[PDB]
Design a protein around this ligand. Structure first.
Ligand SMILES: [Cl-]
Ligand SMILES: [Mg+2]
Ligand SMILES: [Mg+2]
Lengths: 241, 241, 250, 195, 231, 204, 243, 196, 222
């Protein structure tokens, strides 16, 4: 059964190597969540540092692709960094050729088309990663676009990725049924981060210290990650309500 | 490495046959029957469309009979997509020859080159051969009216009347039985249709399931690709419907 | 290093079957239903928008794609394979036609170029076939309105009306009963929505259905005035509202 | 390489080509044959840059001889002239162009007609009753325009050629050491032994 | 078993079998000894014949005036690697007017052998080399293995029954290391070392091959009647 | 050593009422020397007429090229190319050789088989399109033709009148150019008939 | 199955068995460690003395990249040399364009992307080495460890090879007992001790110790080998601790 | 073209004229010769407009890609990238560049890449006429750790003199001030600077 | 050739003359120098006519493919960056001198491009042999905060200065108006001030005037 070793069709019309690449996604046992505010897009990811010898500042699955685009990865760090370096290269080249900052959704489509090639060409293996791209686009506003090893991509009101993805998804689904809108009706990004963290706690049923979380925030004309002290200030606000 | 997944499409069997050529010919044997009949004053090409659907657009359809230049046509049996690659190559080779010598390409030269391309795929490159058999109907000022066939092996031969695709055994016996050398085009038209009518796997032969063409002659050669209504008429006139 | 796979991954089996093409068609069968109907004064192409998640924004994923101002495409099968085929189709409409003849290719010739790309994935080294069937609807001055199906093999056939994917067998039977040569465009849209309701199980509205037409020229969509010969694109994607209006009188 | 003349009469083509090869201040040879048989009924005369002339002529000869073997058929003069023109037309936009001018004289066995083709180094092809290359046309064309008749016999054509060669020997400053004359007709190619 | 088809495949225990099989070619090869003092470095090689009518396969190759090696295993591979060393020695002389350090020679052979163990289609080298030289830091002996592992040693041996000679040099270490400014005595120690790897056959005039390099001694190979002194 | 004026010759095209006319001289020379009085510079691919002036080897080469390309067009499109489309093809093909151009002045003439609209167009050697209602001129006597055309031409001429106008435009232009003349051909092109007339002119 | 026969093939688990097999080769290798300190990094390695015939101090395993980066590895020694050679090309091309010597995080990703590339194709074999490397840049001291998969992180202390579990345990104690930080000269002595303690898992053959260091204060931000009196002082300290 | 870059207490200022000439015709009299290659790394371009615009755009790309991977680049790093492009393609390029940048560590820095393709680090630099750099240019006039107001006046005066004697220079005086505070754009109209 | 671009309140306007010249000879008395790159991005060309048309269509083609790929209306900065990088690569051997103007989601833009690949920004620009005549009118009458009607008047006046005073320019004035939130309006032959006066005499020939050697029916059919 060499139809399970390379990206060719099985008799039932499946690509097993693509399906197994999806299973590699959850190898890190990390859950990510992305939501949109009025003016911002917030992405939160669990931060697990099991080894005591590790330098925790270097353990990250959130990447600053460009000045406006942020990318969180669910999957092994080698494939994550492979995708990150390529996305950084693609965003820079776009700006040089076309004279404007590469949009979140166009970078997503580009990285998805690269992923698609790995599912059709045999010599290249798929990357075992799901890429969640966030920005505040100058045309579309707050944007979430997610890529997977099948070369599939789509836009999201909000999204979740990881082992306990379904639990976070239904939690957010239920909120948007109630609120009757496509975003978190909140002025400041600080309170959109507080919402993201609150709903992850409710979905996973676990509490978080300042070192258990990793936060990325997209505003107009910059994407930035929060320090441990920025998160800690945010966790205090939640607790005092 | 990649050696593991190589089918080795260009190797001999212990019996000294080319596996992929033999299996390509098996493929072609399931294709709709194509008959060429060469008369003293023209050539007939008749081909059976593969199990037609009622909602198929019959009038603006080309499956079996293709024009190579003003003096040469081919009937196809096998993968249509493979045939079209080869047909465009042949159309270009014909215009290259006309550009070079200011003379319409002699039929055999075009046939030999197209056959030599097929041969190449069986001896080198490690690709699957073209799953196509052609009947070439053409005229030149040297040999006059000529019928050839080529198959995936790249072998070509000349014929007075020939069939390719499904039920060639049965079709060749019927042609061998009723064919004679002093035959007219109108007689050859009747033979071609009668032969398809008896060899067909369909309940009854109808205009909508047929493609038809004649290369006839006050000193010029005319190619007539028959319209649906013109097939309907010739099918009533010969008394098959 | 380097692509060592310079040999065909699609080969003839002893039975004469091309396994990878057969298996690609199996993937298309599992695919969501899409259909095309040709009227006298236009063509309609339609498909269900199977939403992966309700959090997903189904507007962003476009299953019906403009190839040229007068040519549109829908698919059944693997969405990513379709997306890269649309990109290659748009580019080849320019590189191998528009940049030579200064006009957009006729439906049959663009279909021919798409078919060629899909045939190459069937024979070239180190690649699998495309796991999609395309329905391409188009208009051109000398051929008028036309509808073509393109298969993983690279084979294409012109249709009066057809369907591909999940419920194509049942959908094709339904179209055979309803289709005549005197259909106006509005009649073909009506039939398309009736046909597609059979194959859709869940919600059936303008947000779960994607539908485009090749019809009259749209001066309003051209984006400039002053050139009388330039009258605008014949391809128009129907809005969520325009679909819901035709579902009331159903 | 200077003088190449051609006359197409009723039933044959006559090619006259100067015998002199000059390098610097000395005449190296006075018996040079500036012609190659392309096929049994097709002859090509050539003049131009040293080396290029023979190299081009022999290259064309080999390609026509190859076609004859492959198809067991003699390519028509029109077909040979079209092939030769295309090779020269390729040459002109090459890195180093062939500076060769040719006359192709052939008998078409299908039409039963003699044919003369004049092709210059640019690939400028023209079908003519009579033709020349370089300065040769300047002293003979006025003479040909006058006496040439299309129903002329081979003997009439040879006499008209003598008149042209005599005018060249009188008014031309260089000594071309006379001409070799070859006739192309239905029976093939033969050389006039004495001129 | 399933993991020895090529050099691009690790075994479940993390072994490269094609490299281990290449290493096996060296064990089948005829014994060659290397040893050095502070002043001189010596190669001793037992040359192998096809039969009594044949010549004896040359084991020692000169690379420069100050460097050369002995081979055990595939002789053609030794020719490829020795030719590569000659070019690197030569590049160093022409570009930098600098004799190539024996250590750098080792590093270059290691890196060349490594590339042939990581790429599909290629195969590992099937030869082991003992490189001796005298450079700016004195006498040197290297052991090359086609795994890419190069090792600097006072003495060693490679080939069939090499363990005998290697055990002797391990015992003698303190004696032969101090043979300074005395070529003949250092060769004698090398010839007595290789003698510990002999079975049935003894050292003859056209059988023994010796090479030496040192302070005021260019890399010179002794064969035939020239090695009669040391029998 | 100016490739456009070695061989010499002229083409002119004109529009009339439901008709177009294209005409050329028959001279091919090698500078001062007249070589051929039968070198036609007007070719047709179906119902689309192309005149080409300039370097004769490129005139022959471009004819052979556009025959090739229009033959393949017809096989694939299953219909004869139209003047408007052919114009773009000539433009594309010339600009492809931008930095090694064909030394030619091509002129397109024909009637659109669908709309019945008379069409003419001219190009420079790198394929810049000159689309014109009235007339197009090309060759070594282009200045002379511009003068003749700009004074003689009036719109909506009938085929029989247009013939006289374009004939007189060409003849009188060719007689004031050393490298043009030696005979002339005029094509009168109606929707579904085409007449070709050889003019009698001075042979110097 | 057969998912472990070809590199770059995902198992139904979503694992690359060929990379996991490369780790076995690393686990089979000698012990190597890295210790991050106040203003720099320390590297140490276990060199097994197979024979008396090995020349002491003249089989150096620790490699320098540029002038400021130290590299040590466990597993297939040639694979480590191949990786360092590439590192030197990357560090050279960075300095050529951007002038500044390559920052350690920048350099880490250059090795990372290269090693990861050798897990994308079946035409290549994964690297059979774990590489402990680091040095001093404009942002201070950095220590990294890189694995056959292409995975790397920043470390306070790093260990790999046959005695990794022993070394890791002894590294974890240093992190706990020195939260305010360890000095460069201290880290050299601790590095020696940890190699001697880690040698208990490889005690058939006796061994030779090898230490290098980059320190802003002690080496002026450059990579130097610990030799002579400072090396013998560290050996004596380690000898005293085992007894 | 008259351009200069001066380092002062709080950072560096970039000044230039606004005149672009084709022969004696002023193609653009309101030219912006102050070009951003990073937030706080700007350059003044002299030589071929096409060549300097092409180079500036490539350097902008390289510093964007540098920032993505390695964070904010030093002025030295920007100077290096400029020099690399200018030095390697010296045979087909006519470009003289002055690089001015602000770091929080290094403060204000000025680098010149002249027509040679060499790199020089200076406290200040002036280029007058055809990319002609002046070594001295009133050495006693420039002091280290000048105030912003002193430095603006020093550049305004220097560029005033150049415009007066040179027809290549003219129009308005544009300045960009690079400090910890941020980026300030200054424009001085002819009626201000001509009466100096 | 005279081409101008003028920025106004809510957009940009470009204008050009309609004369095409081979040296001193007028080849086309009414050619169009206003080229569409995109529906709302228009280009005016000067220099080698084949090069301006060729470069405008190539970038126009690549812009359409980029617009489709990104699902976004094309930006003028994209047309600018793609034109200049193409022109620069050929070191001026493509003699295209362009005024690029248009509206996009970002707003209204006006740029000039030089054959060597240098670009400039302006509120008013002119290019071609009539640029100095045109620029004299722009430097005389241009002000900040022009209306649409003021900008068309200024643009066409600038082209007229070229038509009358420059021998390279003549015939008619073409204008294209790109306003924000509106379809761009192409005003072909906006002004026709150079109408040819009635001729003194009809040069229509009596039929049979021309001598004819041979007639023959040409076969255009199959
Ligand atoms: Cl892409
Ligand atoms: Mg694959
Ligand atoms: Mg004349």
């Amino acid at each position: 059964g060499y139809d399970r070793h390379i990206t060719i069709f099985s008799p039932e019309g499946r690509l097993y190597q693509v399906e197994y690449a999806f299973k590699a996604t959850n190898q890190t046992n990390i859950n990510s969540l992305a939501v949109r505010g009025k003016d911002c897009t917030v992405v939160i990811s669990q931060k697990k540092v099991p080894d005591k010898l590790l330098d925790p500042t270097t353990v990250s699955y959130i990447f600053c692709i460009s000045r406006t685009i942020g990318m969180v990865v669910n999957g092994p760090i080698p494939d994550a960094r492979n995708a990150a370096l390529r996305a950084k290269a693609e965003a820079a080249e776009f700006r040089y050729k076309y004279g404007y900052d590469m949009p979140c959704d166009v970078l997503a489509k580009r990285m998805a088309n690269l992923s698609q090639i790995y599912t059709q060409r045999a010599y290249m293996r798929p990357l075992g990663v799901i890429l969640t791209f966030v920005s505040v686009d100058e045309e579309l506003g707050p944007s979430i676009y997610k890529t997977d090893p099948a070369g599939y991509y789509v836009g999201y009101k909000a999204t979740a990725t990881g082992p306990k993805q379904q639990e976070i998804t239904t939690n957010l689904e239920n909120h948007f049924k109630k609120s009757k809108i496509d975003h978190i009706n909140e002025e400041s990004w600080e309170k959109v981060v507080e919402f993201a963290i609150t709903h992850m706690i409710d979905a996973l049923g676990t509490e978080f210290s300042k070192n258990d979380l990793e936060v990325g925030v997209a505003t107009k004309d910059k994407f930035f990650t929060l320090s441990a002290e920025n998160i800690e200030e945010r966790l205090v606000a939640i607790a005092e309500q | 490495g990649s050696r593991r997944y190589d089918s080795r499409t260009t190797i001999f069997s212990p019996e000294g046959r080319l596996y992929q050529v033999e299996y390509a010919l098996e493929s072609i044997s399931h294709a709709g029957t194509a008959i060429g009949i060469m008369a003293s004053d023209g050539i007939v090409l008749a081909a059976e469309r593969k199990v037609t659907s009622t909602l198929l657009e019959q009038d603006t359809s080309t499956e079996k009979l293709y024009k190579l230049n003003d003096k040469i046509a081919v009937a196809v049996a096998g993968l249509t997509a493979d045939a079209e690659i080869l047909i465009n190559t042949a159309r270009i080779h014909a215009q290259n020859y006309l550009k070079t010598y200011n003379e319409d390409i002699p039929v055999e030269i075009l046939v030999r080159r197209l056959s030599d391309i097929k041969q190449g795929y069986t001896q080198h490159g490690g690709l699957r051969p073209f799953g196509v058999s052609f009947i070439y109907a053409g005229y030149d000022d040297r040999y006059g009216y000529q019928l050839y066939t080529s198959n995936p092996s790249g072998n070509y031969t000349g014929w007075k009347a020939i069939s390719v695709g499904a039920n060639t055994s049965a079709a060749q016996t019927l042609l061998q039985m009723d064919y004679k050398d002093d035959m007219k085009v109108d007689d050859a038209i009747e033979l071609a249709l009668k032969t398809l009518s008896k060899t067909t796997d369909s309940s009854a032969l109808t205009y909508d399931r047929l493609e038809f063409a004649t290369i006839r002659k006050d000193g010029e050669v005319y190619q007539k690709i028959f319209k649906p209504q013109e097939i309907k008429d010739i099918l009533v006139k010969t008394g098959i419907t | 290093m380097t692509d060592r796979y310079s040999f065909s991954l699609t080969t003839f089996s002893p039975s004469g079957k091309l396994g990878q093409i057969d298996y690609a068609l199996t993937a298309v069968k599992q695919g969501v239903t899409s259909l095309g109907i040709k009227a006298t004064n236009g063509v309609v192409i339609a498909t269900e928008k199977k939403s992966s998640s309700p959090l997903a924004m189904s507007e962003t994923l476009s299953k019906v794609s403009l190839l040229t101002p007068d040519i549109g495409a829908v698919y059944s099968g693997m969405g990513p394979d379709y997306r890269v085929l649309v990109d290659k189709s748009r580019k080849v409409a320019h590189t191998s036609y528009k940049r030579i003849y200064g006009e957009y290719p006729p439906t049959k010739l663009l279909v021919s170029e798409v078919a060629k790309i899909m045939q190459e994935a069937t024979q070239s080294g180190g690649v699998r076939p495309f796991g999609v069937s395309l329905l391409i609807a188009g208009h051109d001055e000398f051929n008028g309105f036309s509808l073509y199906q393109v298969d993983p093999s690279g084979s294409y056939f012109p249709w009066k009306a057809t369907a591909i994917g999940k419920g194509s067998v049942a959908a094709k039977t339904f179209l055979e009963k309803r289709w005549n040569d005197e259909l106006e465009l509005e009649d073909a849209i009506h039939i398309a929505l009736l046909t597609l309701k059979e194959s859709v199980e869940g919600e059936f509205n303008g947000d779960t259905i994607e539908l485009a037409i090749i019809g009259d020229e749209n001066p309003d969509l051209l984006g400039y005035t002053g050139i009388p010969t330039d009258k605008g694109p014949r391809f128009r994607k129907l809005t969520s509202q325009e679909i819901n209006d035709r579902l009331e009188a159903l | 390489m200077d003088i190449i003349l051609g006359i197409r009469v009723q039933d044959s083509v006559i090619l006259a080509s100067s015998k002199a090869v000059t390098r610097g201040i000395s005449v190296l040879k006075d018996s040079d044959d500036k012609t190659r048989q392309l096929s049994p009924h097709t002859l090509m005369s050539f003049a131009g840059e040293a080396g290029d002339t023979v190299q081009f002529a022999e290259y064309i000869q080999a390609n026509i001889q190859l076609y004859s073997i492959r198809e067991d058929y003699e390519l028509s003069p029109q077909a040979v002239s079209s092939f030769v023109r295309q090779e020269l037309a390729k040459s002109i936009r090459s890195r180093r162009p062939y500076q060769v001018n040719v006359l192709i004289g052939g008998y078409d066995k299908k039409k039963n007609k003699p044919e003369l083709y004049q092709i210059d180094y640019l690939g400028t092809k023209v079908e003519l009753p009579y033709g020349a290359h370089g300065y040769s046309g300047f002293y003979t064309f006025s003479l040909l325009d006058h006496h040439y008749r299309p129903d002329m016999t081979t003997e009439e054509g040879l006499d008209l050629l003598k008149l042209c060669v005599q005018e060249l020997e009188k008014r031309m400053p260089m000594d071309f050491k006379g001409v070799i004359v070859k006739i192309v007709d239905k029976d093939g190619i033969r050389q006039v032994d004495d001129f | 078993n399933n993991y020895d088809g090529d050099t691009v495949t690790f075994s479940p225990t993390g072994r490269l079998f094609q490299v281990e099989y290449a290493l096996e070619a060296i064990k089948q090869g005829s014994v060659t000894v290397g040893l050095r003092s502070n002043t001189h470095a010596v190669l001793v090689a037992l040359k192998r014949n096809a039969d009594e009518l044949s010549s004896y396969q040359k084991k020692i190759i000169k690379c420069d005036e100050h460097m050369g090696l002995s081979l055990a295993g595939l002789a053609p591979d030794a020719r490829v690697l020795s030719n590569y060393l000659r070019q690197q020695c030569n590049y160093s002389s022409l570009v930098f007017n600098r004799k190539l350090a024996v250590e750098r020679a080792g590093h270059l052979l290691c890196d060349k052998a490594q590339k042939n163990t990581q790429s599909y289609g290629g195969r590992p080298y099937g030869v082991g080399l003992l490189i001796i030289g005298y450079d700016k830091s004195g006498a040197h002996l290297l052991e090359f293995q086609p795994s890419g592992n190069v090792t600097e040693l006072y003495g060693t041996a490679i080939g069939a029954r090499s363990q005998g000679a290697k055990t002797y040099l391990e015992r003698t270490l303190d004696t032969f290391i101090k043979i300074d400014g005395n070529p003949d005595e250092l060769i004698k120690a090398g010839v007595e070392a290789i003698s510990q790897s002999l079975r049935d056959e003894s050292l003859t005039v056209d059988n023994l091959s010796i090479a030496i390099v040192g302070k005021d001694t260019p890399f010179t190979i002794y064969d035939g009647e020239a090695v009669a002194k040391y029998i | 050593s100016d490739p456009s004026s070695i061989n010499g010759g002229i083409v002119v095209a004109m529009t009339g009422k439901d008709c177009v006319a294209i005409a050329c001289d028959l001279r091919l020379g090698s500078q001062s020397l007249g070589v051929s009085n039968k070198f036609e510079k007007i070719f047709h691919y179906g119902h689309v007429f192309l005149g080409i002036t300039g370097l004769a080897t490129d005139v022959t080469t471009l004819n052979e090229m556009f025959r090739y390309k229009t033959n393949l067009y017809k096989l694939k499109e299953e219909r004869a190319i139209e003047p408007e489309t052919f114009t773009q093809l000539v433009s594309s093909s010339l600009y492809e050789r931008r930095f090694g151009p064909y030394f030619v002045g091509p002129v397109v003439a024909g009637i659109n088989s669908k709309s019945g609209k008379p069409f003419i167009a001219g190009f420079d050697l790198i394929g810049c399109i000159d689309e014109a209602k009235d007339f197009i001129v090309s060759g070594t006597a282009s200045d002379q033709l511009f003068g003749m055309c700009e004074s003689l031409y009036e719109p909506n001429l009938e085929p029989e009148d247009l013939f006289e106008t374009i004939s007189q435009a060409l003849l009188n232009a060719a007689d004031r150019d050393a490298l043009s003349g030696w005979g002339a051909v005029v094509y009168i092109i109606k929707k579904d008939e085409v007449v070709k007339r050889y003019l009698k002119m001075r042979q110097d | 199955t057969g998912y472990d026969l070809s590199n770059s093939v995902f198992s139904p688990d979503g694992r690359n068995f060929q990379v996991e097999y490369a780790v076995k080769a690393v686990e089979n290798g000698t012990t190597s460690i890295g210790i991050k300190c106040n203003d720099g990094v320390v590297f140490a390695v276990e060199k097994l003395i197979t024979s008396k015939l090995l020349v002491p101090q003249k089989n150096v395993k620790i490699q320098v990249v540029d002038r400021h980066i130290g590299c040590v590895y466990s597993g297939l020694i040639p694979d480590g040399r191949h990786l360092v050679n590439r590192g030197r090309e990357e560090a050279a091309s960075f300095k050529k364009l951007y002038k500044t010597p390559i920052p350690i995080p920048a350099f880490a990703d250059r090795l990372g992307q290269y090693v990861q590339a050798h897990t994308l194709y079946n035409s290549v074999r994964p690297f059979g080495v774990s590489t402990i490397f680091g040095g001093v840049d404009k942002n201070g001291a950095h220590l990294y460890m890189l694995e056959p998969s292409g995975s790397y992180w920043g470390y306070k202390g790093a260990a790999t090879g046959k005695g990794r579990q022993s070394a890791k345990a002894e590294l974890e104690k240093l992190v706990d007992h020195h939260p305010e930080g360890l000095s460069a000269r201290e880290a050299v002595k601790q590095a020696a001790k940890i190699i001697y303690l880690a040698h208990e898992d490889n005690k058939e053959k006796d061994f030779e110790l090898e230490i290098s260091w980059c320190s802003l204060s002690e080496t002026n931000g450059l990579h130097k080998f610990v030799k002579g009196d400072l090396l013998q002082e560290a050996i004596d300290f380690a000898q005293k601790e085992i007894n | 073209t008259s351009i200069m870059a001066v380092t002062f207490k709080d950072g560096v200022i970039l000044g230039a004229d606004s005149r672009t000439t084709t022969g004696a015709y002023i193609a653009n009299r309101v030219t912006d010769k102050l070009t951003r290659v990073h937030d706080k790394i700007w350059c003044c371009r002299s030589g071929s407009a096409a060549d300097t615009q092409a180079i500036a755009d490539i350097v902008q790309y390289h510093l964007e890609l540098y920032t993505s991977q390695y964070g904010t680049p030093s002025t030295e790093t920007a100077a290096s990238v400029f020099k690399e492009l200018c030095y390697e393609n010296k045979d087909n390029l006519t470009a003289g560049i002055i690089v001015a940048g602000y770091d929080d560590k290094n403060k204000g820095e000025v680098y010149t890449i002249p027509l040679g393709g060499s790199v020089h680090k200076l406290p200040y630099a002036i280029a007058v006429s055809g990319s002609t750099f002046i070594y001295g240019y009133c050495d006693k006039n420039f002091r280290e750790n000048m105030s912003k107001e002193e430095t603006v006046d020093f550049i305004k005066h220097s560029l005033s003199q150049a415009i007066k004697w040179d027809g290549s220079s003219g129009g308005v005086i544009r300045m960009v001030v690079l400090t910890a505070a941020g980026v300030e754009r200054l424009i001085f109209y002819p009626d201000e600077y001509e009466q100096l | 050739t005279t081409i101008v671009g003028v920025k106004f309140n809510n957009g940009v306007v470009i204008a050009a003359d309609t004369r095409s010249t081979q040296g001193p000879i007028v080849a086309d008395k009414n050619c169009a120098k206003l080229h569409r790159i995109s529906p709302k991005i228009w280009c005016a060309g000067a220099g080698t006519a084949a090069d301006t048309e060729a470069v405008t269509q190539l970038i126009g083609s690549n812009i359409e493919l980029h617009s489709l790929y990104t699902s976004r209306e094309p930006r003028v900065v994209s047309a600018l960056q793609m034109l200049k990088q193409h022109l620069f690569k050929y070191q001026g051997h493509i003699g295209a001198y362009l005024i690029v103007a248009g509206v996009d989601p970002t707003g209204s833009h006006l740029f000039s491009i030089h054959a060597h690949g240098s670009t400039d920004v302006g509120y008013y620009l002119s290019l071609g042999s009539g640029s100095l005549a045109a620029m004299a009118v722009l430097e005389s009458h241009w002000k900040q905060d022009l209306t649409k009607e003021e900008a068309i008047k200024l643009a066409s006046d600038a082209i007229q200065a070229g038509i009358w005073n420059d021998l390279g320019s003549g015939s008619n004035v073409d204008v294209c108006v790109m306003e924000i939130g509106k379809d761009a309006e192409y005003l072909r032959n906006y002004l026709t001030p150079n109408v040819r006066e009635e001729k003194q005499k009809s040069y229509k020939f009596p039929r049979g005037t021309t001598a004819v050697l041979k007639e023959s029916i040409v076969n255009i059919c199959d």
